[PDB]
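Sample 3 of the quickstart, ligand EEB:
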Amino acid sequence: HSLKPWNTFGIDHNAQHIVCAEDEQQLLNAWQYATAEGQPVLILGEGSNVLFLEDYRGTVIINRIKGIEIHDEPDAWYLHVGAGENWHRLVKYTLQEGMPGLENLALIPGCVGSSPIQNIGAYGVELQRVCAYVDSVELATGKQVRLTAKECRFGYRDSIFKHEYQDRFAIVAVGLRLPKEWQPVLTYGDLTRLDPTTVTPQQVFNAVCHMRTTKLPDPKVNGNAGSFFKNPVVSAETAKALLSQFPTAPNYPQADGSVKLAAGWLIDQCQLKGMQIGGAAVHRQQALVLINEDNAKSEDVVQLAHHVRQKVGEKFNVWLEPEVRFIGASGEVSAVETIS
Ligand SMILES: Cc1cc2nc3c(=O)[nH]c(=O)nc-3n(C[C@H](O)[C@H](O)[C@H](O)COP(=O)(O)OP(=O)(O)OC[C@H]3O[C@@H](n4cnc5c(N)ncnc54)[C@H](O)[C@@H]3O)c2cc1C
Ligand SMILES: CCC(O[C@H]1[C@H](O)[C@@H](CO)O[C@H](OP(=O)(O)OP(=O)(O)OC[C@H]2O[C@@H](n3ccc(=O)[nH]c3=O)[C@H](O)[C@@H]2O)[C@@H]1NC(C)=O)C(=O)O
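Result:
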């Protein structure tokens, strides 16, 4: 069975079984069944962060556990959201319902269960800010677990679910804490033009969606998995050196002296916008996004990434690391290794 509907990149590879789990017991059943048949199991929300490299030897579970629960506290609305829930429709609903605090993370694809995994962030906010806890099933034992946001170990596009807990657990629900006292995050890009007291949550939603819509490709049109590489963090010295010859480089300094750079700027600086390898290209309005321009095979996407990464590594000696998850036949492989 074909994985192509199940991943936003539009990559056509195959799995032994693909299965929609619409409740927790169901998911657990499908996992127990495939691992009892010696098969690997892959859980997916919408497949918007995965690149299939090969045909997959096991079972792919599509997490579709839905439902929202809202618990009132004097300080905050607490939401208990099913993993199979679509994140942008949750952002829309929460705002429609008078519970703001998710608008900066508007239009990010995927399911709510997947949002802790890579600490979803855009426009000044990461999921860690409104995340209370995450609920999982210990797939290997049925044991139901709850982690606090602290125990989640949130990082820039990181969490415990990319390490200790990865294939051991399946997320079934995420707990969100939205403060009743709304507080607008207007620190990023065109949001700094909005005033903190006149602005409604819906104008931030619109302001964010407009920046997104102007630069980012629709997977409906051309398949992609968003920002293919992470923004590089370099040493204080190396950032100063690159910024000596390249003064206008977007850079985001840390307290601890090190500097984050813009990976999309560095790719752009190598004149790779519009560059193609087979059906895969570097998107012209945002060079950090690789796309499925025409019936792209997974090897084309891997080669374009190897090409873009070598070019930036030769020009800037900054070596780019992918944010997309590389899935090979028996489970996830190392993406940098595959594009080296
Ligand atoms: C157009 C576009 C724009 C994007 N914009 C952003 C952005 O602004 N900011 C940002 O941070 N990201 C962004 N992304 C990346 C993407 O939306 C995130 O990585 C998102 O969290 C993935 O959601 P998903 O449900 O599609 O995960 P999937 O791709 O289905 O899975 C992701 C990984 O997590 C695992 N996982 C998925 N569901 C579960 C579960 N229930 N239990 C255990 N593991 C699970 C999978 O096995 C896999 O390793 C964008 C992507 C696209 C296509
Ligand atoms: C699809 C988006 C996405 O996540 C993205 C998020 O929405 C966005 C806003 O907060 O910031 C990241 O992109 P990015 O850092 O490129 O955001 P941008 O504001 O577009 O640009 C940063 C700097 O790069 C420059 N830039 C970017 C692309 C380009 O082709 N040319 C260029 O000059 C910009 O002008 C800017 O000064 C996210 N990425 C990471 C890896 O941290 C994802 O993870 O999938």
